[PDB]
Amino acid sequence: ILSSIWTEGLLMCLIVSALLLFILIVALSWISNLDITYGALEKS
């Protein structure tokens, strides 16, 4: 057996849910860096 706590199925759920959470953190850091061009909305 691989382990009793860190079994064959838990340890490859925590790789899938680490890859997906990595893609999520990257995509949320893309959307967090999204700013509005305010000079093209004002009168000045």
Binding site: G9, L10, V16, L20, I23, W30, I31, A40, L41
Partner: protein, 153 residues
């Protein structure tokens, strides 16, 4: 052969197929909608022809919705790891593809609707660029709908 943790991957694939696709569609709607709102304060008659990038970003989210619905009709309590990881792959494919296609449509769309108000010949240019970025969601949808057909065989 069909363990107890096997519908985790299918449920998280059904999750990610709409999550990453809606993140990409939200970036493609928001960033290209800033360009619509910035463009149409000095030339407002271009408002309903500049609406194409948010429509294409919505088509991306429809492509993700299709995969999420078609994955959640094949989930069961006692499915194999084969079905689970193939639903996971069908989720990841359309997730990364809709995310990439939505980022590309968002970054091309605001630049296109800004160049279209200065030069009128750039409307056909931005449409022909955004059609290449639209079908990348189709390129993930193909792998998602092919891995869906191999779910229970």
């Amino acid at each position: 052969l069909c363990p107890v943790y096997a519908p985790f991957f299918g449920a998280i694939g059904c999750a990610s197929a709409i999550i990453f696709t809606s993140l990409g569609a939200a970036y493609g709607t928001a960033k290209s909608g800033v360009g619509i709102c910035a463009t149409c304060v000095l030339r407002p008659d271009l408002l309903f022809k500049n609406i194409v990038p948010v429509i294409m970003a919505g088509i991306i989210a429809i492509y993700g919705l299709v995969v999420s619905v078609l994955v959640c009709y094949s989930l069961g309590q006692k499915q194999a790891l084969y079905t689970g990881f193939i639903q996971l792959g069908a989720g990841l494919s359309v997730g990364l593809s809709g995310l990439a296609a939505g980022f590309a449509i968002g970054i091309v769309g605001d630049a296109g609707v800004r160049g279209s108000s200065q030069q009128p010949r750039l409307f056909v240019g931005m449409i022909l660029i955004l059609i290449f970025a639209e079908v990348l969601g189709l390129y993930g949808l193909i792998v998602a709908l092919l891995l869906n057909s191999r779910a229970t065989q």
